[PDB]
Amino acid sequence: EPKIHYRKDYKPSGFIINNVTLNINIHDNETIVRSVLDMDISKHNVGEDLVFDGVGLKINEISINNKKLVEGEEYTYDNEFLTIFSKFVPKSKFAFSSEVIIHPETNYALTGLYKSKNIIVSQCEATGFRRITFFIDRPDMMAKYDVTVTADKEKYPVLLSNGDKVNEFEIPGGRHGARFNDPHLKPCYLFAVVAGDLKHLSATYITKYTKKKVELYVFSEEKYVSKLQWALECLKKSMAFDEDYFGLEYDLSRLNLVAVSDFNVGAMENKGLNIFNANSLLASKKNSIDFSYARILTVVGHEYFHNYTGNRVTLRDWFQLTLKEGLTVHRENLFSEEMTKTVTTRLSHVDLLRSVQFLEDSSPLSHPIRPESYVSMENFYTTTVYDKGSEVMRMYLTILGEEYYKKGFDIYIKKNDGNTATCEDFNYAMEQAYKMKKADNSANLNQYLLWFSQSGTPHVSFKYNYDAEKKQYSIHVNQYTKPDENQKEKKPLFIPISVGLINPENGKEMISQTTLELTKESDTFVFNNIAVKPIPSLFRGFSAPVYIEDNLTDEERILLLKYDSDAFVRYNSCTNIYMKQILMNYNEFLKAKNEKLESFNLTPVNAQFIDAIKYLLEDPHADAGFKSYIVSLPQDRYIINFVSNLDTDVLADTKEYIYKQIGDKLNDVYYKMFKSLEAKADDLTYFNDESHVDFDQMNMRTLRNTLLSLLSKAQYPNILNEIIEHSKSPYPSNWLTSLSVSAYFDKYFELYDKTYKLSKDDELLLQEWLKTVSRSDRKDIYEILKKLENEVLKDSKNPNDIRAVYLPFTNNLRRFHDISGKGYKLIAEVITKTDKFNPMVATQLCEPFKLWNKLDTKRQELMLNEMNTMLQEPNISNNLKEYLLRLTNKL
């Protein structure tokens, strides 16, 4: 809650920075940064003081045009802003020079310049460049960079910054230097530097259309150079995809990707020098679980795609974040759907959005994808801006279709290349394409802007009529968004509804798929020549980011699950059956608890639904990934969107009942499929080949591991033998599952020791092991956390370690939410501890408190007490204070 920046207040700077010439001299106990800004006065200038951002800098010298400026007389510096009084600021082109001292060796917040293990590395987005040197540190201040880095040669043999390496030189005293020129105008947030004893793999890529030769290097510490192979393949895939779908080619002679051990987020798109959390760049089949492959593909792609949507077209201001992030996520999703060719890839996104993003959008943190105000920009790198952003960017492709979408996208890139841009710029481009598609210059996408400005998730509900004799069917649709703090009156959105109509007698499609365009609060869509009463297949591919109220019977939903063509509608039909059941049994258990009944009834799971699950499971031509979705209940964070004053214990009992009802019918089926899938699931074709992954085979393993979990909880006879055997697989996805599912057996602690010994000498694998323990369904999980703290985590400041120990545990419904509040106290203590050195990670660890006002009134109180205690810690960070104030309804 200090200074609050507002979106309508945007004004261009009174100043211009045209070039940046940096020298960065790294020493053991200090790094010295000399910087010349070649600057000018803008047409917006009104003779104001020249104010630079600069945070924690120790000033050696400051000058303008070779004249030394002095503290008190010519400048003030308060550790956050440097003010050059106007009477000493020139009125035409001038050279500002500064030299400062910084200390990456003691920078544990991992913003600005820092040391990660033995690598020196920067992270500048959003406001980190000001921790390196003085700057007008905002994205519309675009300049060209000339960067020299020096260091001890033995410790830091490899020196990297943005763009072309133009010189390498030796320095007396065992030092060396490298100079880089980046020809592309950029904002400072895309500046990067790395120095280290790095090893690499490389390739040359030739661009499709202009035949530009591009050198591709991927880098890590020596211990893990062999884990770089997949990344380099993913980069080549990415490049090809942007050329093939978007006609976009890379624009420098060289592209480097670098892994570092300590990183607050996944990776960063610094021009020509993308930097990664090692967990999102490094893998090997012997030392990584499966999910690493899709992770790396996603993150390499995402950061590559930013070359156009973020770097060549950048942001005017930070309120426009979703323009680069939503759009880049949508680009990556298209890429990943094309690379994987599995329906589970779209389903995984939808599952994330409806759980994590819907929760945010009904919390006190709710915001539109283009926010109106902020305090710490770091708090607005949200699932809203990324995920709901991406669904907003995706709806344009749904509305326009592939050809006109690619047209609109080209107009956007062409118009804004080399410049900053706003969300309205993108909409205007898509609007040009829309007019072309409707053949009508009066068509507009003004209404579509409300996807940017209006917060909250729309609810879309349905009523059906069929006239048997006229062969006529109608779908009446209503949309509603719940008023909130951002808008007391909500407006109808442009909602695309992809639909099919299934004949329930034969399972066949009755119409060409079509996209209904709902733009009013309600509308009735009518279909002729509908030969029988259909079942509607609604929101195919999850065509808009909404709460779908299908108004279907379970019988109808079963028919969709079995016979519809669309993976999402099939999965959603299943999800809705589960949700009806959960809500019903939750209410039954809740009445029992509150009225202290001695006896009561529970509604049984629909038997035909069960049969339908069985039929799907036993179908050898049905997709293994899809099957894993059908046997899993909806996520807790999805469910909670449907329940007020949620008693988490009652929910836990509800889920256990339902899983047991299903298992009591299907466990023999589960076991037969677990055994029959083994040959194809665990086949070792390509186990030595890091350039190729079979994602279908991976989904077979996921299914096997899901079934093993289900069978383990049920205590299926002799399943312990199957778990033991599974712990000998060469696939870490399997042997870490073995640990997980062994939670329900006396052998857990044997498998804990065994898998720890298998994980401990690979830092990323050890982190996957920590996650596995943390997520284990153990009665003694609090004592197991203490053991991790004492034996493994200890004093680590590595965010991947901290996150791995605590975050999975916070998803343990029964234990995290223990009615004592001990879980809440435990995570609050970790947040407070962590905020003292890394505020961004501290705010990340507050994730489980986002649903506090959705819980039962005792749990609500217990969470609020912990948040209020954290807010009382002295020297709480602005990141964490802002976050908690907003979450608790004070800001």
Ligand X SMILES: CCCCC[C@H](CC(=O)NO)C(=O)N[C@H](C(=O)N1CCC[C@H]1CO)C(C)C
Nearer to ligand X, 128 or 177 (CB): 128
Q: Decide: is 289 part of the binding site for ligand X (CB under 6 A).
A: no
| Count of alpha carbons within 13 angstroms of residue 156, beta-carbon side | 26
Minimum distance of ligand X from residue 630's CB (angstroms) = 26
Nearer to Mg ion, 764 or 846 (CB): 764
Minimum distance of Mg ion from residue 453's CB (angstroms) = 43
Part in contact with Mg ion (CB under 5 A); list of ranges 338-346, 477-485, 503-511, 790-798: 790-798
**205, β-bridge pairs:** 214
391 is in an annotated binding site: no
In the set 126, 259, 265, 765, which binds ligand X (CB under 6 A)?
A: 265
Length of the chain: 891
Give the distance, in angstroms, between the CA of residue 187 and the centroid of all CA atoms in the same chain: 23
Total binding residues toward Zn ion, as defined by CB under 5 A = 1
Best CA proximity match to 107, nearest among 134, 132, 79: 132
Part in contact with Zn ion (CB under 5 A); list of ranges 95-103, 254-262, 325-333, 719-727: 325-333
267 is in an annotated binding site: yes
Q: Decide: is 815 part of the binding site for ligand X (CB under 6 A).
A: no
74 catalytic? Reply is: no
Site string for ligand X, 342-381 (x = CB under 6 A): ---------------------------------------x
The residue with tokens 């807010």 is 871
722 is in an annotated binding site: no
Nearer to Mg ion, 733 or 798 (CB): 798
Minimum distance of ligand X from residue 280's CB (angstroms) = 7
Nearer to Zn ion, 198 or 385 (CB): 385
Q: Decide: is 266 part of the binding site for ligand X (CB under 6 A).
A: yes
- What is d(CA 232, CA 258) in angstroms, rounded to the nearest whole number? 11
Minimum distance of ligand X from residue 354's CB (angstroms) = 16
1 is in an annotated binding site: no
Site for ligand X in 816-875 (CB under 6 A): 844
Site string for Mg ion, 794-813 (x = CB under 5 A): ----x---------------
Nearer to Zn ion, 54 or 326 (CB): 326
* C-beta separation of 239 from 205 below 8 A: yes
Minimum distance of Mg ion from residue 109's CB (angstroms) = 17
Nearer to Mg ion, 628 or 798 (CB): 798
Part in contact with Zn ion (CB under 5 A); list of ranges 248-256, 317-325, 684-692, 767-775: 317-325
218 CB-contact burial (10 Å; exposed 0-12 / middle 13-18 / buried 19+): buried
SS3 per-residue string spanning 411-477 = HHHHHHCCEEECHHHHHHHHHHHHHHHHCCCCCCCCHHHHHHHCCCCCEEEEEEEEECCCCEEEEEE
476 is in an annotated binding site: no
Site for ligand X in 382-441 (CB under 6 A): 386
The interface partner of residue 266, options being ligand X, Zn ion, Mg ion, none and the CB cut-off 5 to 8 Å by kind, is: ligand X
Part in contact with ligand X (CB under 6 A); list of ranges 240-248, 302-310, 683-691, 713-721: 302-310
Minimum distance of ligand X from residue 799's CB (angstroms) = 7
Find the catalytic residue in 74, 99, 303, 722.
Answer: 303
- What is d(CA 607, CA 627) in angstroms, rounded to the nearest whole number? 18
Part in contact with ligand X (CB under 6 A); list of ranges 68-76, 259-267, 337-345, 855-863: 259-267
Q: Decide: is 763 part of the binding site for ligand X (CB under 6 A).
A: no
Residue 725: φ, ψ to 5°: -65, -40
Minimum distance of Zn ion from residue 198's CB (angstroms) = 23
203 is in an annotated binding site: no
Minimum distance of ligand X from residue 306's CB (angstroms) = 5
Minimum distance of Zn ion from residue 302's CB (angstroms) = 5
- What is d(CA 436, CA 443) in angstroms, rounded to the nearest whole number? 9
Nearer to Mg ion, 151 or 766 (CB): 766
Total binding residues toward ligand X, as defined by CB under 6 A = 13
Nearer to ligand X, 303 or 682 (CB): 303
Best CA proximity match to 116, nearest among 19, 225, 261: 261
- What is d(CA 693, CA 690) in angstroms, rounded to the nearest whole number? 8
403 CB-contact burial (10 Å; exposed 0-12 / middle 13-18 / buried 19+): exposed
Query: Which residues, 6+ apart, have CB-to-CB distance to 619 below 8 Å?
Result: none
The interface partner of residue 336, options being Zn ion, ligand X, Mg ion, none and the CB cut-off 5 to 8 Å by kind, is: none
CA dist list (Å): 875 to 45, 352, 835, 880? 37, 34, 9, 10
Part in contact with Zn ion (CB under 5 A); list of ranges 99-107, 318-326, 708-716, 843-851: 318-326
The interface partner of residue 504, options being Zn ion, Mg ion, ligand X, none and the CB cut-off 5 to 8 Å by kind, is: none
* C-beta separation of 707 from 672 below 8 A: no
Q: Decide: is 295 part of the binding site for ligand X (CB under 6 A).
A: no
In the set 179, 184, 186, 302, which binds ligand X (CB under 6 A)?
A: 302
Cis peptide before 126, with omega less than 30 degrees from 0? yes
* C-beta separation of 419 from 314 below 8 A: yes
Q: Decide: is 190 part of the binding site for ligand X (CB under 6 A).
A: no
Nearer to ligand X, 252 or 268 (CB): 268
Nearer to Zn ion, 325 or 801 (CB): 325
Total binding residues toward Mg ion, as defined by CB under 5 A = 1
In the set 99, 233, 262, 269, which binds ligand X (CB under 6 A)?
A: 269
Q: Decide: is 306 part of the binding site for ligand X (CB under 6 A).
A: yes
306 is in an annotated binding site: yes
Site for Zn ion in 174-203 (CB under 5 A): none
Minimum distance of Zn ion from residue 95's CB (angstroms) = 34
In the set 257, 268, 723, 805, which binds ligand X (CB under 6 A)?
A: 268
Minimum distance of ligand X from residue 265's CB (angstroms) = 3
Best CA proximity match to 415, nearest among 399, 400, 401, 431: 431
- What is d(CA 105, CA 119) in angstroms, rounded to the nearest whole number? 10
- What is d(CA 807, CA 815) in angstroms, rounded to the nearest whole number? 13
**120, β-bridge pairs:** 115, 195
At 315 the three-state DSSP class reads strand
Q: Decide: is 313 part of the binding site for ligand X (CB under 6 A).
A: no
Please provide the DSSP assignment of 174-228 as one string.
TEEEEEEEEEEEE-GGG--EEEE-EEEEEEEEE-TTT--EEEEEEEEEGGGGGGG
The residue with tokens 């001990």 is 822
Q: Decide: is 808 part of the binding site for ligand X (CB under 6 A).
A: no
Please provide the DSSP assignment of 519-552 as one string.
-SSEEEEEE----S--EEEESTT--SSSEEE---
Positive or negative, the CA dihedral 458, 518, 449, 189 is positive
Nearer to Mg ion, 65 or 106 (CB): 106
| Count of alpha carbons within 13 angstroms of residue 874, beta-carbon side | 0
Part in contact with ligand X (CB under 6 A); list of ranges 51-59, 296-304, 482-490, 508-516: 296-304
* Residue 744 neighbours by CB distance under 10 Å: 20
* C-beta separation of 825 from 867 below 8 A: no
Element (H, E) at 166: strand 164-171
* C-beta separation of 513 from 496 below 8 A: no
Annotation: binding site for a peptide: 125, 266-267, 269
The contact set with Zn ion (CB under 5 A) reads: 325
The contact set with ligand X (CB under 6 A) reads: 265-269, 299, 302-303, 306, 325, 381, 386, 844
Q: Which residue numbers are catalytic?
A: 303
Annotation: binding site for Zn(2+): 302, 306, 325
The contact set with Mg ion (CB under 5 A) reads: 798
Annotation: binding site: 125, 266-267, 269, 302, 306, 325
